[PDB]
């Protein structure tokens, strides 16, 4: 039997708001460590990896390890019925075909129950090794989302150029071209970490703006976003879900033949 209660349930809704549009069906791996989800999109160009640890939960019990296949769209439809200030509990026995979600109001007067049907899926799981990258850029989540949207109004692919002085996002389309330059600031800031850069070797890469616009749907999850990348390897856009864990989006570059 599996049971987990978390008070800051808005998190879950945000999680699915970032996942429902990119992935349609995923495989939630449930273990004593916490909750894991790794799945690629239909194009096999990008990967989503979510990990949320047990310590963040208010209560967590899991006797048998589970690997339940879920329709992200249906579960997001369900979680849309929950207020942002509700306490959410997830429950599912071992040999079960349903997942129970319970919404408890703060005033303890409204209680909602839901049972969603599970499904058996064939998830191709990739092996991501731990590695260091040539450039790691931390910047406000909303600023990254704005940059991605603005360049999406211009072209379909973005060129990221990272050095020690700053970062530059370039994009060209039929109407013209555009560049967005963020310079290394003065380290007095905080949650609006005016772009910090840890650089090993300068790196310029090219990616598709559509995938990045799908990625930026995880903006409400974290205050800052971290773009990790090196030469000719997929970028890692990471959003740290406060205390809980992290949510990473791997995106493969574009190389010239």
């Amino acid at each position: 039997m599996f049971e987990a209660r978390l008070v800051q349930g808005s998190i879950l809704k945000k999680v699915l708001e970032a996942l429902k549009d990119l992935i349609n069906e995923a495989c939630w791996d449930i273990s004593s460590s916490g909750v894991n989800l790794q799945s690629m999109d239909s194009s096999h160009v990008s990967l989503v990896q979510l990990t949320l640890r047990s310590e963040g939960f208010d209560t967590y019990r899991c006797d048998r390890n589970l690997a339940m296949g879920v329709n992200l769209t249906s579960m997001s439809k369900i979680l849309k019925c929950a207020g942002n200030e509700d306490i959410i509990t997830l429950r599912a026995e071992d040999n079960a075909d349903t997942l129970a979600l319970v919404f408890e109001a703060p005033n303890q007067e409204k209680v909602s129950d839901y049972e969603m049907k599970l499904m058996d899926l064939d998830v191709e799981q990739l092996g991501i090794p731990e590695q260091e990258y040539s450039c790691v850029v931390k910047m406000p989540s909303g600023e990254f989302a704005r940059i991605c949207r603005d360049l999406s109004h211009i072209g379909d692919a973005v060129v990221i150029s990272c050095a020690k002085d700053g970062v530059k996002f370039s994009a060209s389309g039929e109407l013209g071209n555009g560049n967005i330059k963020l310079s290394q600031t003065s380290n007095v800031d905080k949650e609006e970490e005016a772009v910090t850069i840890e650089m090993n070797e300068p790196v310029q890469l090219t990616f598709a703006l559509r995938y990045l616009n799908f990625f930026t749907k995880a903006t409400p999850l974290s205050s800052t976003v971290t773009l990790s990348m090196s030469a000719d390897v997929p970028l890692v856009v990471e959003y740290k879900i406060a205390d809980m864990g992290h949510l990473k989006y791997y995106l493969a570059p574009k190389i010239e033949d």
Partner: peptide, 15 residues
């Protein structure tokens, strides 16, 4: 021109 690659080109898939 430039070609969009996939994750499979970099990592390997288990079950």
């Amino acid at each position: 021109k430039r070609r969009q690659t996939s994750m499979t080109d970099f990592y390997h898939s288990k079950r």
